[PDB]
């Protein structure tokens, strides 16, 4: 027997849980499948924890400036397990409220872990029981990168992320092995927390996608906050010692001969190198769904895979990594599929990024060397500022605040948006509106500033 | 004799500092006189050392959290002495960075009191010496209303926000008359940092031109953090005791009978009750230029007098009581006289405003009420949330985050936003570029989220 829905959603977190509440509004008969918990990465392992622990390391960061500040120094070390339980419990609520939410919804949830089957009309089975539809969402996710043993031996002496969030307690020596976001994030948490902590990176500088200058700044403010950047690195091999383990690295620095050195005593090996699909038991090849060579599911600019009636969104496809995408990329697709709405799509144009660092970055649009591509060497113009936060004023521990504006032909589009300072966590995402409405430069200056804040840097480049 | 300019500058604070250097990057030959400080009100007695007392007091009411977020208590006494004494250091830097900053641009600072003399072609005389020009720019600024003895006897007892930045011990007990932002600010600072406060007002709640939910709010918010808010009282008299002062009280509240109280033991009495215009010593009857009752410079939208060749901008005036205001007002205003832009003045509308509450509140455009006159109740639509910032998930201490946005006509064009929360005060600035531009609720809802923030619940109304 075979229980037929409108819409079936594989994967309940982000981009499941939107695309599936969004065409339950539209009337449709839908069904979510979770192996797991409800709320996927960002809740359980990702966005949400990760932001408590970010909270937490940036507390305690201030918190080195409480004398400065007038009042009695705050002599006390860190108690790791006090978060972590109240961290769980957070996690705990929200698992909670997304199983309501699908409730109220009258979604209903399918416990399990869905395979599609060889019907040539499209069916999953979960436990043993099937299940069609005429519209089936893969939204399955990803999972951490972790290095062969015929590559590193010893790599699974490692653990990724989602060991970070198992941790009972704060190693007391870390390695992190990566040079984008997550790694730096980590890197950032672990050392403001008291670890003595290294990030391990293949070049010179952390970031290497985004702008230039933050790339370059974001390395300075890691080494300027006591994280080591062992750079031009790489690790070659992970022995267990009496005491945690011993990580065998190569430095090869341009200009130099390459050197051995054994790294000792590690509590925490971390890797962050990056992410791999969720697809590797759907049994995609029962129905001739394509993938690219690392498992990613393929799709158009309306999520459609190769196969009608198939659709995927989120981590599982690979682009644009982030939790608001899989969402908007959902709901668009319900729109789409269940208003009759042809042209609704994600744009992935214009769509901003946080990092939490120490301070936080922001960007929105083109980096530079994009713009100078796509436009012409002669037809961009940047505006850039460098400035010590008011709030550093009265204290001996200092960061820093970098801001570039990316311009555009004649008119000064504004094309891009990078920062890195105090603030900048919430201070980008009116500056993303304006970005995706086409402003210009004189947008920007024709808008009275905000005094005194760091925003105001923005609205006042010249 | 008479020395000759092409711009005389009175007064040294934000208005005149940005005229007078734009003028002078035109090419004006240029003066600028000040009887005091260079800096004027924001950076001596307003802007810059309110904000360094704010992060001071933010410091503390976040340490109210240390424990929840696992660390040993900071079981510690302020020492004001140490943080005022941080405060007039940064105000000195500035006053040393603005006198550079005339001196760089070769503009000449002429110190002394400014008036105008009876010589029909405009002219002032500083110290006993004359100088004239074809424009001449009043930015005088303001400075605290204090009442009359006559009306309120002993109120010269009591202090205003000048006196605030001379004080040089915390106040055991602060009573704070007045329920406007500078009011506002002032008992949460205080209160944050361990005074026992209240704060006196005419009405129910606070910022009563604010839009209602940010009136309520706010007072709502006052009083969770111990301010106590004595609400529908006036001072009837104030009197020196063995111990600091007595304020006598009348409180009047609809439905009951007025009665009078005594608050006893008062170290601090602070007027914060509105701000008069520095024009009383300047001689402008001498060339009958226009004021209104209270003192203020009335001028036309480019900023002209009711003379010609004579301008005013920034405080003085009454409008828009800013430092951008005064900043862009000044710019607008050089460049119509000195780059020939009739065009060139400052747009009023849409102007944005951060309060350093706690949590700060932020504001662009129209309230809900006004947008209801201007366009029709049949014609606005508002979109609001309330929520609890996830930096409180871990702790026992919470404040809450209020947003409201006001749409007008079919196109939902977005006429106001407001709100109050963690973070408000960096996330404005980009909205109000928004706004500016004339932004829609939809292109608020076409730019992706940025999660997990509080700025991203701006993004995500329905
Ligand atoms: C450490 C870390 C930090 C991050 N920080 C941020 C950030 O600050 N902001 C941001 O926007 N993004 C951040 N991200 C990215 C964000 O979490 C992901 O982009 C987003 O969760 C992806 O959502 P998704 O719906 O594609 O997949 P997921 O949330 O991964 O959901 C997939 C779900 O499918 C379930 N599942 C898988 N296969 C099956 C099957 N066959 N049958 C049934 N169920 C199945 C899984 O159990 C899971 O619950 C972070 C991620 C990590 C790991
Ligand atoms: C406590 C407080 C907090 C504030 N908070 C903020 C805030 O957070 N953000 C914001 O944007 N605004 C804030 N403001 C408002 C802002 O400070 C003022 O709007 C701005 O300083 C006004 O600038 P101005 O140029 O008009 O006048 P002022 O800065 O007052 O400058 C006038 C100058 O003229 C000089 N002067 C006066 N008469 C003469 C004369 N005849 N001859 C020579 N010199 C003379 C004075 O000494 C003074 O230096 C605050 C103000 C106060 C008091
Ligand atoms: S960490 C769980 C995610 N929540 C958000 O990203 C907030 C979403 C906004 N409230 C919004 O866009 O409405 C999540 O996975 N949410 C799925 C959902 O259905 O909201
Ligand atoms: S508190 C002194 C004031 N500074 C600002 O408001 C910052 C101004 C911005 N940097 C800008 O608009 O450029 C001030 O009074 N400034 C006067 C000046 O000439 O900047
Ligand atoms: N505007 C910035 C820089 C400080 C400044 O204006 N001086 C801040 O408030 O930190
Ligand atoms: N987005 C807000 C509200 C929390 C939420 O999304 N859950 C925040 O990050 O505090």
């Known amino acids: 027997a075979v229980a037929s829905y409108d819409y079936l959603v594989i994967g309940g977190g982000s981009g499941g849980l939107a695309s599936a509440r969004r065409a339950a509004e539209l009337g449709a008969r839908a069904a979510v499948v979770e ?45 790791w397990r006090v978060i972590k339980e109240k961290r769980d419990a957070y996690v705990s609520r929200l698992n909670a409220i997304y199983q309501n939410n699908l409730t109220k919804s009258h979604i209903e949830i399918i416990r399990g872990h869905a395979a599609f089957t060889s019907d040539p009309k499209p069916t999953i089975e979960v436990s043993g029981k099937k299940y069609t539809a005429p519209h089936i969402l893969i939204a399955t996710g990803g999972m951490p990168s972790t290095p062969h043993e015929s590559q590193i031996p010893g790599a699974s002496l490692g653990i990724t992320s989602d060991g970070f969030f198992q941790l009972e307690e704060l190693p007391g020596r870390s390695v992190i092995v990566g040079a984008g976001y997550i790694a730096v994030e980590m890197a950032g948490i672990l050392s403001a927390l008291g670890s003595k902590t290294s990030l391990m990176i293949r070049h010179d500088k952390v970031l290497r996608s985004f702008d230039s200058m933050i790339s370059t700044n974001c390395t300075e403010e890691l080494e300027n906050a006591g994280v080591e950047v062992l750079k031009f690195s790489q690790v070659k091999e992970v022995k267990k010692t009496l005491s945690g383990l011993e990580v065998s690295m190569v430095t090869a620095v341009p200009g130099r001969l390459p050197v051995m050195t054994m790294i000792p005593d590690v509590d925490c090996l971390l890797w962050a190198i990056g992410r791999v699909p969720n697809t590797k038991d759907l049994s995609l090849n029962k129905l001739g769904i394509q993938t690219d060579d690392k498992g990613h ?166």
């Not at 709320?39 to 990702?46: L, P």
């Open 297 to 462: 599911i393929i799709v158009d600019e309306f999520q459609n895979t190769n196969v009608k009636g198939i659709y995927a969104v989120g981590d599982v496809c690979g682009k644009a990594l982030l939790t608001p995408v899989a969402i908007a990329a959902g709901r668009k697709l319900a729109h789409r599929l269940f208003e009759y709405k042809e042209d609704s799509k994600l744009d992935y144009n214009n769509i901003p990024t946080v990092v939490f660092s120490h301070p936080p970055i922001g960007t929105v649009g083109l980096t530079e060397d994009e713009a100078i591509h796509k436009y012409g060497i002669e037809n961009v113009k940047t505006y850039s500022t460098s400035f010590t936060p008011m709030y550093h004023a009265v204290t001996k521990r200092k960061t820093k605040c970098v801001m570039k504006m990316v311009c555009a032909n004649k008119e000064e589009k504004v094309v891009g948006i990078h920062m890195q300072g105090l603030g900048c966590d919430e201070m980008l995402q009116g500056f993303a509106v304006a970005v995706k409405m086409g402003a210009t430069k004189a947008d920007f200056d024709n808008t009275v500033a905000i005094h005194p804040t760091s925003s105001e840097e923005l609205v006042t480049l010249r």
């Open 35 to 79: 192996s797991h918990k409800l709320g996927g990465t960002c809740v359980n392992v990702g966005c949400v924890p990760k932001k408590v622990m970010w909270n937490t390391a940036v507390h305690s960061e201030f918190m080195h400036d409480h004398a400065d500040y007038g009042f009695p120094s705050c002599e006390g070390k860190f108690n």
